[model samples]
Target: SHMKFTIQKDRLVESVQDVLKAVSSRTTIPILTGIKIVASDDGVSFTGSDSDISIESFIPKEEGDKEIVTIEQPGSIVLQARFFSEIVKKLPMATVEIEVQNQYLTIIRSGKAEFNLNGLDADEYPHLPQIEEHHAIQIPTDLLKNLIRQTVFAVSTSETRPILTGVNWKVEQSELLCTATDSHRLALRKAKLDIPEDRSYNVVIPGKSLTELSKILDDNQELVDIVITETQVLFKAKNVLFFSRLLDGNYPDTTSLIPQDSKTEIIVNTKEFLQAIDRASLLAREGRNNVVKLSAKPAESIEISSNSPEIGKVVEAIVADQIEGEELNISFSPKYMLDALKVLEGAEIRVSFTGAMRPFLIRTPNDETIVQLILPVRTY
Candidate 1:
């Protein structure tokens, strides 16, 4: 009457977890809230989407000569996503057996306890368009995650300028550059990629999309094949393919936002600087401006302090590895400074400032590829 197959419960559980990254209960398309499964001779793929982005998770019939699924019959079906998500992990058996009747109904079983799921017509499900051109960039999973973690935070959270909510990513020559800004503050990270020279393209991906993609990627895969299309960006890792649509409009060229040279510079340990700012953050958190003032002291130390009218002040001193140029006095959000410091690598950081009323840049003394810029609050 239909099709029959047996798959490992452990594998099914994780595949459901992966694809569910895109599924949301708030979708307008009724079927979009459910999971779509397509089983083929090659493997079975599960899709979850809100339409803006789609995450496809798959399980092979065999892997490294290990058995994951035994395809007695190839087929496809749709199930109430949350229901299966609720039951799959708690299934009592090591393997789950599936049978479909008249190429329609689906019956799932693990040992004695079983489920009869009224599968929906998968035809109603939506998916991202297939792009065949070769604009693919293969990067390590850890590095891809690192890029997003560093830049995504600086994107604008408000929709008054919807375009600023996306992270600008470009592939030029053999380098990949990621930039995110809210007009006032910016974070840029640059890394080298092994690609054929001179394939250039720029795309701004939604901050929420990149943030979600980062959540699903981990040590399971060594490398992720990044495919950039005219309207979409897809990351293929192991057996999962996560897709995100690109944002409209071009991002403004942000090269000039950073100062070409600094009038003030200081090198300090990241841990000490962050701890000082973090403590300073506590006193400024309730203030309207939420900022702490930093001044270079005569003794080659930085004085970070916050003043709130209704509350007491907090002042801390941090010794720098080196202090050069003019004496500095600047006020900025302790939250933003702490955010940048956490993302930066290595123990030592070099802070460069132009003047009291200008944007300052933060970079590591050992690494030249990343720059974090923050503008000072005009308190004068």
Candidate 2:
């Protein structure tokens, strides 16, 4: 097969950057190290994958007032990603010309610069899985990205528990819920769906995949269509299609982890509370657990402090707008608390503690869209 195409350097470089996230230099499969380019009558498409995650980006023949791509012959080839990406980025001219000779020789030329790369057979590239549209759901691009940012951080980085490395997604009664936890802390977010029929799904999506997809998503895009299957989930946004394999295994039930009652409740400014914790964590980092202690001051305020025998001690008292219930003295990792607080959007934050030794809940008043739970550390 023969393929020839002329494309704008900017357009080609943009597509290369988009798919490069899936290209892995350490992949066991050699073909995955290169990007698969297929030129057809429609346009030129670039694909990159590591088997687990794949990204396909298509550049149309024309974009608005400019002719972005012109395909002369239909063909496919897999070019080494590292060299190809760098070549495109440093092209001497505004446009690039690509053509294939024989069966494996590909030539790329721009201005006075030309390079020949030995390409692999595109036919050997693994076929992308086809996802049925039976369970398709649409969500606003911004909303979905926010959900990912809100929960993906809580996912466990340790591979000891594979299930915890993914975010649990559940859809029931037209409500979409996303949850992630590493046993030390948990993040949960809920939103409503407009599906035509009542359906349910329980799937664990890899945090790394979601994190990458979120970065590629355009906040200005209207909506993103999601198709879910037994093994794969497809996220379609504008001209991008991101496919990710679901993690195999049942996610542990985390419903019982949230405390229903609290012995102490404190309402304080989100920024103030976050800043105090951030400052205290500086000293806490020198310690073993990176922990900070919070002690209630009757009806006045709460004192946040950390002690590092080698570094020093820091105490910051943040006055509360409202303090209710009993007293509390709880210690927890400042890193975990900071992560949860960063995503909490509101002027005021409400913190509830069942006891000094029990896990506490943090959220904004009158807003249940997001909930954060952190287990306290016992420090005598």
Candidate 3:
């Protein structure tokens, strides 16, 4: 169906901007790409580049409009995000008119601004995995976001080994467990669900995909329906279909990495510790790997240091609290530690380790729902 529509440019642009980050600059495949826009009685839907990852957005007609949005006809169309967003934002009118004829939409405004875009048939875009009603799971948006924020960072960005760059999501009766590991470090985030059955399934989602999904999600209280299949995963929100291809291969069994006993424990103010690491890493940031060394005195201060022959060295100490267990000392990338700290929301935190070189655990002072682990770098 052809449609005549007019919408405020700023509102539309902001919605598309939310997911634009996931749109790849490389248009390698034909249909795995392109922004898919669909219009209906409810509102407009935007799906941008469903290649390795996709960012979907929905913009409803604004309530209480001084004409928030105007529609004479309703239909769907797919346009290119890179060119479309630029045109929409820079258009010379307060209200831009979009008219479609024979699968091409001409965007026009009064003051010498017009664009004729060759929109592809929305049907030509590959269908995202359709999750049947029988195979969907409900997860709170906040919980899912928190899980991604906590674990996605541990996924290795390097293609040195492809499988290590994704997360393993294991879902079973009433609970979901997410784990990510780059071998050097590991992170796990778990949450309770209202799932009624004792079914179990696992999916290896690309690390980059989860990161993009996390950024597009809002902190709102609404929940999303997550549907998984052999090849793709879909996150269905109000009017968006966020789809991502699943990573193939068996993710390494990381359950054994979480030691059941802790030989050393230290509790300290979270912000203070983060600041200390940040300051100590100033010189380390200049190094190739941004490595920082740490030593917990157990009764005094935690020493943080790094050295670069070309950039000199840094040794700083932050006061510790209730540190114990064999005078534990370890070294790791400050960047990884910082990523772990950002999602932990609390004043003080407890950190535990089995040994100086083993994977250590970090947790919020009052919540056990979120946990983070980092494997120490061997610095002799």
Candidate 4:
């Protein structure tokens, strides 16, 4: 007979919300829209995804008598996200029991009501790659999250060239580096790893995957186990697991793009400079895209300006603490520059460049852990 059960409504709701992020909105067939809940000897694991992003959570049977899960019999079923969530949210009982028979799954709570959901075989679901422990590295969650946020946003979203849209990741000498570029701008962040390795390796990960992973990362400074292989990266937390397929191909060697020395260097207050750029971009934002012009004259006021063919021009000025080397004038998208500055938690920033038309770098005063490079867009 199809079974029935009850659970604390809030608990079920919370669990579903956590798993829904992994559920693919675009499954090959209709059944993929539902999450698969499987009860095994170890515990109950719920998985969801939209193919590109997959998240799985396993709640053990017991953790200090908390009563996380209870299984009367071993079974598995796929429950539609729409109906499944409604039941979890509205059920008034402290317990909800699930039963399955034929192609229908039943959910009931003591004397309240029941939910009949059309079910599908869990075996037909697509499988995610499982990485071995030997190929993984342990990193601090906080640091890893910071790295993802710093770089993923810079990935190119266009289909012009497939590889440019992915983040290039490299691990070498107990260090990890992440890079993203969209032909116009780039962001790079590095983390000093604790794991020892024999050789340097590089992998390209889709920016979209890293963005999702960043959102799911716990703010706590716990250790996250990262496993990478030929074509995938896996993030294993305590009760949750995340898997992402790696992009295949050679990431462009962008090391030569960074200037070894600056032709014109300016040190400005991060908050103040950001404020000036923000104001300048306001005028540009009214245009086609938020593009602003930057003018830095040696030992003179730093002038920011933007104009639109349809909208009027706006200009603002800020004094730099110090300006050295040759004078430079450049134009770029303030939107891109603002993103690079927001993630940088630094007081004073050094903006260095080779020439008026060359790409420039934005970074902290003395630290080198994070770097942002923006290629100047010729507005003329």
Q: State each model's CA lDDT, in order.
A: 0.86, 0.91, 0.77, 0.79
Model 2 RMSD in angstroms = 1.3
Model 2, residue pairs in steric clash = none
- Over the stretch 102-142, how does candidate 2's per-residue lDDT look in tens digits? 96899999999999999989999988888786668899999
Q: Against the true structure, what is each candidate's TM-score? A: 0.94, 0.97, 0.87, 0.92
Best by lDDT: 2
List candidate 2 segments past 4 Å from native.
285-287
Instruction: Quote the positional error of residue 341 for candidate 3 in Å.
Output: 2.4
The candidate, 1 or 4, that scores higher on TM-score is 1
TM-score of 1: 0.94
- lDDT for 211 in candidate 3 is 80
Better of 1 and 3 by TM-score: 1
lDDT of 1: 0.86
Ranking by TM-score: 2, 1, 4, 3
The residue-by-residue lDDT of candidate 4 on 49-118, one tens digit each, is 7765678877676667677567676677778876687667777677777777776644545445766777
Worst 10 residues of 2 by lDDT: 282-291
